[PDB]
Write an enzyme that holds these catalytic residues in place. Structure first.
Site, PDB file in Angstrom:
ATOM      1  N   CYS A 125      -5.640   0.898  -1.447  1.00 35.16           N
ATOM      2  CA  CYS A 125      -6.314  -0.375  -1.246  1.00 35.16           C
ATOM      3  C   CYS A 125      -7.323  -0.833  -2.114  1.00 35.16           C
ATOM      4  O   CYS A 125      -7.714  -1.992  -2.566  1.00 35.16           O
ATOM      5  CB  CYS A 125      -7.130  -0.407   0.234  1.00 35.16           C
ATOM      6  SG  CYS A 125      -8.674   0.498   0.412  1.00 35.16           S
ATOM      7  N   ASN A 145       0.877  -1.162   0.063  1.00 37.79           N
ATOM      8  CA  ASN A 145      -0.042  -0.017   0.098  1.00 37.79           C
ATOM      9  C   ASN A 145       0.763   1.158  -0.032  1.00 37.79           C
ATOM     10  O   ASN A 145       1.784   1.308   0.811  1.00 37.79           O
ATOM     11  CB  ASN A 145      -1.052   0.015   1.231  1.00 37.79           C
ATOM     12  CG  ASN A 145      -1.686   1.339   1.458  1.00 37.79           C
ATOM     13  OD1 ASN A 145      -1.084   2.258   1.906  1.00 37.79           O
ATOM     14  ND2 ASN A 145      -2.875   1.322   0.615  1.00 37.79           N
ATOM     15  N   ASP A 183      -5.793  -8.532   2.003  1.00 43.22           N
ATOM     16  CA  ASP A 183      -5.849  -7.286   2.738  1.00 43.22           C
ATOM     17  C   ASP A 183      -4.282  -6.520   2.296  1.00 43.22           C
ATOM     18  O   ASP A 183      -3.496  -6.538   3.301  1.00 43.22           O
ATOM     19  CB  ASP A 183      -6.038  -7.337   4.240  1.00 43.22           C
ATOM     20  CG  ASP A 183      -6.200  -6.164   4.884  1.00 43.22           C
ATOM     21  OD1 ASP A 183      -5.946  -4.894   4.240  1.00 43.22           O
ATOM     22  OD2 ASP A 183      -6.739  -6.150   6.097  1.00 43.22           O
ATOM     23  N   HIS A 214     -12.054   1.580   3.886  1.00 41.55           N
ATOM     24  CA  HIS A 214     -10.752   0.748   3.592  1.00 41.55           C
ATOM     25  C   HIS A 214     -11.633  -0.319   2.710  1.00 41.55           C
ATOM     26  O   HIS A 214     -12.530  -0.987   3.172  1.00 41.55           O
ATOM     27  CB  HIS A 214     -10.311   0.244   4.833  1.00 41.55           C
ATOM     28  CG  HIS A 214      -9.141  -0.939   4.568  1.00 41.55           C
ATOM     29  ND1 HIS A 214      -7.923  -0.638   4.017  1.00 41.55           N
ATOM     30  CD2 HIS A 214      -9.397  -2.427   4.666  1.00 41.55           C
ATOM     31  CE1 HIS A 214      -7.462  -2.036   4.053  1.00 41.55           C
ATOM     32  NE2 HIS A 214      -8.030  -2.610   4.402  1.00 41.55           N
TER      33      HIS A 214
END
Lengths: 564, 76
Positions: free
Chosen positions: A15, A10, A273, A256
């Site tokens: 994201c 990231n 993630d 997110h």
């Protein structure tokens, strides 16, 4: 990794891009197509397809998280855009269009429409006049209405449901002017890959702003879609398998993104993630993203699925066809391989680091708390070497350090310098210690010697304390020499030393050893024929301690009595 | 010419427009009729998101074409 695949770094607020990139990366037929794009004369700074080729290459080959740094640069984005929060479906509509146009004039031209494009009909019938209009349009996704519907079935029913063109929305029939009409929509083609966008937003008149709809909405694992086609097919039903769930946590314009996938198409799900991929269960990818839990309120309340990716049952094999290195052109593999070599040349501007708190054992055999800052995506050698320029190095000594994993005051294994820092246990029980290898343990004789774990305990084998350490034992040695070494390692008073006792410990059962029989044999410190991920037997030292204490608890204590 | 927009409740509304209208002009008419601020609306047609600065004729949007209105769930 623990899963086969790896994640993406990231940059700040990327994201959505990482999620969508993972979604497309496991669209194997699309990946194979992107590999074949002509980017041989293209500039790295300005080629979206080439940057996509890089990200796909690294996601396939690398086992450390992949950077998307060049990908945003090829978009023409400055670093201020790397902190923008965006909509993943919006990025999908822009990126797929841009690449489809860039594939035009190439050999894989028309790949995106063959996988994502479908057709629908808009029928219009006038209620008071004989006027029937007909319009065929294309689409790459479906915006399913959410509020008031219980699951996907009801939302498709409402989409194809006949709507009324009344009042201010009268149909311009041209000849008969504005007429009251009825508008209906039916599906003619359902593409091999189905992107559904859950309309999780509405206007709230109480606050005069747009709001995310966090209500409950169910999506099935298997999707029957012949109900909503105009003409069906008994030889190829529109049956779909869930392939991806793009989850959005948070607010209307902030939050997110996360992505769940079963890449192989088999049902073995895992969660992506950002820079962490981790296996999960089917219930965590599906049921737990229907969401619309307004109880015990924490993130869960606004965490729910946003984009669904289904694949046709009859197309599962071509879409998810395996990808070897025989699918990747030579000049791309060598473009990127010879591209990295220009970086072993180059202190500033580093990085998304982590704080690592651990114990540093010094030359004087005492402990120091120290906190280091290594690359979260670095390895153990980076941490050890990061220690070496944050401490004293000993005037002269081995100069090579090691990392120990200690649970319950016993050393339960040494970590190799290759181990990635991400794969270290974050559990509370674990405490890591960096110490400098002693001279006799650097290059140790394999046949006769071995490094064994030593720890202190007190009359119970599970009552351990103090500071464990590694001790070199020589074959057939007389034990009085081993004691000679151990004493030279603790350096407390001579009086406390004879009080010691020595024992072999395995699985809670223990056998004391004779200090005067001198019997050192390596067979006594080896596991059961077959076991190694089974606790290594260890040597224990029995004696009395110097320890810290805690407050006295009263405020009414103690006893218990029934007076009558 | 009259086009259709599918709104955030899944209902179809009409818009009276001309081929030379820019996307911002179309969004302004959607604001006038539906109340949604131009800066939060996105219009999708035939899979391509319509871009500000271009006109309807650039996209071959015609009488009875349907545009799909959506808004954003930002994340980062």
């Amino acid at each position: 990794k623990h899963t086969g695949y790896v994640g993406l770094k990231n940059q700040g607020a990327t994201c959505y891009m990482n999620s969508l990139l993972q979604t497309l990366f496991f669209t194997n037929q699309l990946r194979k197509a992107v590999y074949m794009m002509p980017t041989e004369g293209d500039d790295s700074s300005k080629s979206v397809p080439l940057a996509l080729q890089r990200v796909f290459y690294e996601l396939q080959h690398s086992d450390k998280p992949v950077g998307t740094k060049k990908l945003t640069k090829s978009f023409g984005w400055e670093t201020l855009d790397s902190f923008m929060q965006h909509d993943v479906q919006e990025l999908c509509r822009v990126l797929l269009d841009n690449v489809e146009n860039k594939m035009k004039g190439t050999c894989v031209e028309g790949t995106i429409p063959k996988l994502f494009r479908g057709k629908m009909v808009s029928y219009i019938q006038c209620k008071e006049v004989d006027y029937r209009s007909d319009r065929r349009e294309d689409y790459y996704d479906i915006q399913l209405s959410i509020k008031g519907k219980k699951n996907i079935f009801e939302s498709f029913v409402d989409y194809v449901a006949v709507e009324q063109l009344d009042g201010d929305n009268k149909y311009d029939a041209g000849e008969h002017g504005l007429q009251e009409a009825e508008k209906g929509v039916k599906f003619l083609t359902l593409p091999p890959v189905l992107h559904l966008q859950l309309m999780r937003f509405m206007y709230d008149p109480q606050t005069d702003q747009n709001i995310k709809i966090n209500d409950r909405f169910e999506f099935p694992e298997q999707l029957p879609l012949d109900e909503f086609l105009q003409k069906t097919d008994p030889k190829d039903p529109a049956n779909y398998i869930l392939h991806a769930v793009l989850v959005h946590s948070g607010d209307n314009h902030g939050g997110h993104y996360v992505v769940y996938l079963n890449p192989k198409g088999d049902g073995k799900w895992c969660k992506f993630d950002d820079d962490v991929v981790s296996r999960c269960t089917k219930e965590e990818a599906i049921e737990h993203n229907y969401g619309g839990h307004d109880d015990d309120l924490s993130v869960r309340h606004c965490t729910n699925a946003y984009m669904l990716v289904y694949i046709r049952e009859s197309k599962l094999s071509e879409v998810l066809q395996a990808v070897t290195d025989h699918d990747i052109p030579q000049q791309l593999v060598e473009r990127l391989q010879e591209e990295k070599r220009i970086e072993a040349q180059k202190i500033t501007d580093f990085e998304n680091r982590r704080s690592f708190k651990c114990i540093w054992l010094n030359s004087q055999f005492r402990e120091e708390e120290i906190t280091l800052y290594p690359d979260k995506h670095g390895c153990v050698r980076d941490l050890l070497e990061e220690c070496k320029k944050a401490v004293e190095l000993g005037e002269k000594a081995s100069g090579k350090l090691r990392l120990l994993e200690i649970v319950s005051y016993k050393i339960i294994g040494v970590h190799q310098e290759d181990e990635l820092l991400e794969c270290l246990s974050p559990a509370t029980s674990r405490t890591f210690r960096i110490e400098e290898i002693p001279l006799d343990q650097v290059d140790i004789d394999k046949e006769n010697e071995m490094l064994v774990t030593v720890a202190h305990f007190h009359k119970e084998v599970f009552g351990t304390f103090g500071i464990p350490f590694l001790l070199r034992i020589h074959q057939g040695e007389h034990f009085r020499e081993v004691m000679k070494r151990i004493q030279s390692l603790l350096d407390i008073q001579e009086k406390e030393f004879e009080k010691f006792k020595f024992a072999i410990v395995m699985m809670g059962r223990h056998q004391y050893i004779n200090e005067d029989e001198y019997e050192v044999n390596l067979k006594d410190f080896e596991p059961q024929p077959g076991n190694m991920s089974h606790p290594r037997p260890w040597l224990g030292l029995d004696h009395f301690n110097k320890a810290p204490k805690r407050s006295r608890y009263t405020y009414l204590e103690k006893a218990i009595k029934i007076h009558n | 010419m009259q086009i259709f927009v599918k709104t955030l409740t899944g209902k179809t509304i009409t818009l009276e427009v001309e081929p030379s209208d820019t996307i911002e002009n179309v969004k302004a008419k959607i604001q006038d009729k539906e109340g949604i601020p131009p800066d939060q609306q996105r219009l999708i047609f035939a899979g391509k998101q319509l871009e500000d600065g271009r006109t309807l004729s650039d996209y071959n949007i015609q009488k009875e074409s349907t545009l799909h209105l959506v808004l954003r769930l930002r994340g980062g």
